[PDB]
Structure 1
Amino acid sequence: MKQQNFCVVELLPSDPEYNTVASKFNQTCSHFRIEKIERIQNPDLWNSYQAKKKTMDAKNGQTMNEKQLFHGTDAGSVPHVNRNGFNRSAVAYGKGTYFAVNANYSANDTYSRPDANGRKHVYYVRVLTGIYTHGNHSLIVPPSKNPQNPTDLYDTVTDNVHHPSLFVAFYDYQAYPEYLITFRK
């Protein structure tokens, strides 16, 4: 809704942006080899991401609304995620998109399924986690904060509010696949 055409830009190992991303990945995934790291440049998707962030910022106070989190997926999904991000298109904590604090969660073969050539795919994603609570299975949206004021909902949900290892997001444009890590065993 807008075409959200994208460019994919490989970064070189010398690039500081490469190392920022590789370093975060390497905290838990050093034992894998990284074949490449790309930036996904999709200006329509980014513009719609930045619009929801502006809204979230003007609303959540001192809160750092954005976290950078990981998401493993199969090779088939990579061009979908590039065009559309994490679109509306079951589970423990709700029916939305799952993101992980630590790369080794996403690196599991059940998420980042290895292709024919053994390549695995993990995105390093800007996610608007905002204000979060503990989730549950039947959430098709996050719960309301106050029952007296029931339209202001939580922004995301999590497994553990003081020690999260995962977050679930439900809305469109709440997440931007800024980087794709292609790697192998």
Structure 2
Amino acid sequence: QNFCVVELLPSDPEYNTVASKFNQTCSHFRIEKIERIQNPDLWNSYQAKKKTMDAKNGQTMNEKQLFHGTDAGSVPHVNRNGFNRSYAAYGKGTYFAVNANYSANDTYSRPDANGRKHVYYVRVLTGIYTHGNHSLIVPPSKNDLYDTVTDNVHHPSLFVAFYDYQAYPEYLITFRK
């Protein structure tokens, strides 16, 4: 469960890609730093699920880059386990938002004692998805089951994942009001 945290410089293209995406809905916030999380075992397991999904859902673009706001205390945990079973209404899973505004909410990305906020820019294997419900602990059956559940199938603003390795916390955005 080892990992490396690499901080990106603004001068950086990778920084500008993650930043501009964040700034579509959260430009009013001040970005302090953006870090790339490198956890090799979690990345390999995520790519093993991606290779399985790609050779199953045909023409479907299984991967989406979504946002996840969390308290500063959960950061070490996500860095090593991902969006684990001991970490996790439309279901009893882990929620990922299309736009950063949902994740930039103080109830999710709880400002710490220094008033810093935490949002992950996650690689999520959304695959084939349907509408969700409150009683879901796992995704519902098709007639096998779907990969994720969403609030609105044709105009989604969030996705809920249920199994591990379905999401990779690629970047971590540390910002303040």
TM-based fold match above 0.5: yes
CA distance in 2 between counterparts of 1:181 and 1:76 reads: 15
Correspondence list, 1:69-84, <5 A: 69-84=66-81
1:15-56, Cα deviation, whole Å (9 max, x unpaired): 111000000000000000000000000000000000001000
TM value normalised by structure 2: 0.98
CA distance in 1 between counterparts of 2:43 and 2:28 reads: 32
CA distance in 2 between counterparts of 1:90 and 1:20 reads: 28
Indicate if the aligned counterparts of 1:91 and 1:137 stay in contact, CA closer than 8 A: no
* 1:14 match: secondary structure: coil
1:122 to 113, 119, 123: 119
Indicate if the aligned counterparts of 1:90 and 1:137 stay in contact, CA closer than 8 A: no
Indicate if the aligned counterparts of 2:68 and 2:97 stay in contact, CA closer than 8 A: yes
Correspondence list, 1:9-158, <5 A: 9-89=6-86, 92-145=89-142, 152-158=144-150
CA distance in 2 between counterparts of 1:176 and 1:160 reads: 23
Q: CA deviation at 1:130?
A: 0.3
Q: CA deviation at 1:91?
A: 11
CA distance in 1 between counterparts of 2:87 and 2:62 reads: 27
* 2:134 match: secondary structure: coil
| C-alpha spacing 1:90/1:158, structure 2 compared with 1 (3 Å) | farther
TM value normalised by structure 1: 0.94
Q: CA deviation at 1:90?
A: 14
CA distance in 2 between counterparts of 1:134 and 1:65 reads: 17
Indicate if the aligned counterparts of 1:127 and 1:175 stay in contact, CA closer than 8 A: yes
* 2:121 match: secondary structure: strand
Q: Which moved more, 1:151-160 or 1:10-19?
A: 151-160
Indicate if the aligned counterparts of 1:40 and 1:180 stay in contact, CA closer than 8 A: yes
1:108-147, Cα deviation, whole Å (9 max, x unpaired): 00000000011000000000000000000111111111xx
Query: Gaps (5+ residues) in structure 1?
Result: 146-150
| C-alpha spacing 1:91/1:5, structure 2 compared with 1 (3 Å) | closer
* 2:31 match: secondary structure: strand
Percent of aligned pairs sharing the same letter: 98
| C-alpha spacing 1:125/1:91, structure 2 compared with 1 (3 Å) | closer
Indicate if the aligned counterparts of 1:67 and 1:129 stay in contact, CA closer than 8 A: yes
2:160 to 165, 168, 172: 168
CA distance in 1 between counterparts of 2:146 and 2:134 reads: 16
Q: CA deviation at 1:152?
A: 1.6
